[PDB]
Amino acid sequence: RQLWKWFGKPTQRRGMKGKARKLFYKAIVRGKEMIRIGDCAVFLSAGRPNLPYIGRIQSMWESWGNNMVVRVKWFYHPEETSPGKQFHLRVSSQRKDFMERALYQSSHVDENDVQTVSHKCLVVGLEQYEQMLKTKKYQDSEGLYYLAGTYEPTTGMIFSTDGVPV
């Protein structure tokens, strides 16, 4: 549908003019929606849309040839972690919407086309999430997730938000 475009002027430039030039931007806009660096977003994916690609935006830039790029730090759904779904004491204390609403942060970063961004979402701490659920706007939790810890895809290890290997 409609394309994301840059908001305003670049924040920074790298390289000489020409094929090596890179113009960095803090925000993209589409109609009345704005997404900025530090926000989390849902990305368009190929299939299985119960596991949307969700990432934190680290930086965005345009390179030569009208290429709009976003650098993304991916979150992982608990099903996606190598311990799988069956792995999810710790089981007792976890919310009953854990499989649907919890996300692990990771250090897995990728560069992607800005036009694969679908829409903004929120990934907050557990206590923040529970307080937001008491309200009316965030009643229904649309696009709202909470952080369950860290996943290391290279080792398969999961860590709590306190850094405790799980």
């Binding site: 994916s45 990728d110 086309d113 694969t116």
Partner: peptide, 8 residues
């Protein structure tokens, strides 16, 4: 662009 890509 059509769909995003993930490495591993």
């Amino acid at each position: 662009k059509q769909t995003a890509r993930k490495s591993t």
